[PDB]
Amino acid sequence: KQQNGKLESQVEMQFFSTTEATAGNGDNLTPKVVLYSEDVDIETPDTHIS
Amino acid sequence: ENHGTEDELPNYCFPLGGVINTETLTKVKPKTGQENGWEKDATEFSDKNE
Amino acid sequence: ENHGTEDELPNYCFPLGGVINTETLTKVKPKTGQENGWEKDATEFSDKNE
Amino acid sequence: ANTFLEEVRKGNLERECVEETCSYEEAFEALESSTATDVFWAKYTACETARTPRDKLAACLEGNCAEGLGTNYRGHVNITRSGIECQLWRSRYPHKPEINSTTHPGADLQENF
Ligand SMILES: [Ca+2]
Ligand SMILES: [Ca+2]
Ligand SMILES: [Ca+2]
Ligand SMILES: [Ca+2]
Ligand SMILES: [Ca+2]
Ligand SMILES: [Ca+2]
Ligand SMILES: [Ca+2]
Numbered sequence: 001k002q003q004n005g006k007l008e009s010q011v012e013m014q015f016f017s018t019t020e021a022t023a024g025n026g027d028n029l030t031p032k033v034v035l036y037s038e039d040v041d042i043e044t045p046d047t048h049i050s
Numbered sequence: 051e052n053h054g055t056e057d058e059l060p061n062y063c064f065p066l067g068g069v070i071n072t073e074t075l076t077k078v079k080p081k082t083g084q085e086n087g088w089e090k091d092a093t094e095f096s097d098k099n100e
Numbered sequence: 101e102n103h104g105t106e107d108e109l110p111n112y113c114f115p116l117g118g119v120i121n122t123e124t125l126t127k128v129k130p131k132t133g134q135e136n137g138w139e140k141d142a143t144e145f146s147d148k149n150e
Numbered sequence: 151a152n153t154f155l156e157e158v159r160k161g162n163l164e165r166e167c168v169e170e171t172c173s174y175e176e177a178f179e180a181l182e183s184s185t186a187t188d189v190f191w192a193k194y195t196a197c198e199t200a201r202t203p204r205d206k207l208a209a210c211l212e213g214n215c216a217e218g219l220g221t222n223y224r225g226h227v228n229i230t231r232s233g234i235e236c237q238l239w240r241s242r243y244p245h246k247p248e249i250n251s252t253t254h255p256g257a258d259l260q261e262n263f
Contacts, residue, residue: 015088016075019098020174022090023184029088031078063113071157073175121153 012037074098122150151176163190168207192256196222221257228262238262 002008015031022029077095081087090097127145131137151170163180166172167190172180174187181187190211197210199218210217213224228236239247239259250259 015078015080016099017078017088019074019076020178022076022078026081026087026089029078031088033075071154121155 010038072100074100124148124150168204168211188255189258192258193222195256223263224258224260226263236262 014035014037016033016035017029017031021032076097077091077099078088079091081089126147126149127141128138129141131139151166151173161167161172161176161179163172163177165180166176167180174191177187177190181190193211193213196218197207200206200210206217209215210222213222215225216223230236237244238261239250240261247259
C-alpha cells in the first residue's frame with residue numbers, strides 16, 4: 001500500500017550484457033538479457049526437506 | 051493380443067541441476083541523462099553471474 | 101513374492117535431435133586426369149557440412 | 151569451442167587456444183588476466199601467419215624468435231643488422247620513439263630489445 005490504490009506491485013527490472021563485451025569501455029554496450037525480480041509467498045504444503 | 055502402445059506424450063529425463071549449459075554475464079545499469087547508454091555497476095553485485 | 105525382474109534388454113535413451121556431437125567438413129572431389137588426385141569443389145555444396 | 155560436454159570442462163589456453171581455436175571467452179577462462187588476453191590478441195593478430203603447427207603458434211606467441219614480420223618478437227636480441235648497439239625505447243636518446251603503447255600497444259615494447 002502507498003496511501004492510495006494501496007495494492008501496488010513491487011516488481012523491478014534488471015539488465016545484463018556480455019562480460020568480455022563490456023570488458024572494456026562502453027563502446028555501445030547494449031544490454032543483452034533482461035530479468036524481472038519480484039517476490040511471492042512461497043510455501044510447501046505437502047513435502048518436507050530430506 | 052498385441053494392441054500396440056499408448057505413447058502420445060514424450061518422456062524427457064532432465065539434467066540433475068536443472069540446467070548445465072550456461073554462460074556468464076555482468077551487471078549493467080542505465081547511463082543517466084543521455085536518453086540511452088549504459089554503465090557497469092559492480093558496487094553491490096558480482097561481476098560474474100550465471 | 102519375489103521372482104526378480106524381467107530386464108534382459110537395455111533401454112538406452114538418446115539425445116533430443118539424435119545427434120549432438122557433430123563435426124564440420126567440406127566437399128572433396130577427385131581431381132581429373134592424374135589418378136588419386138583430389139581437390140576442393142565449392143560451387144554447389146556449401147562450405148560447411150555438419 | 152565445441153562438444154558441449156567440453157563446456158562442463160573449463161577452457162584452457164594450451165588446449166582450446168593454441169591447438170583448437172579458442173574464443174575470447176574461452177581464451178578468457180584460459181588466461182583469467184586481462185593483460186594476458188591483451189597479449190594473447192596482440193599475438194593472434196601477429197600470429198595468424200603461424201596458427202599451425204602448434205610449434206609455429208607457440209614460437210610466434212613467445213616472441214623469442216622471428217615470425218612473420220617479427221613484430222611479435224619478445225627475445226633478448228639487442229644487436230642490429232650492422233651491429234650498432236640498440237637504443238633503449240624508454241630513453242628518447244638518441245632517436246626519440248614516438249612509437250609506444252600510445253600508438254601500437256600490441257608489440258609490447260621491451261627494455262632495450
Ligand atoms: Ca560466460
Ligand atoms: Ca572450448
Ligand atoms: Ca572444444
Ligand atoms: Ca562456451
Ligand atoms: Ca570454456
Ligand atoms: Ca579440448
Ligand atoms: Ca598437451
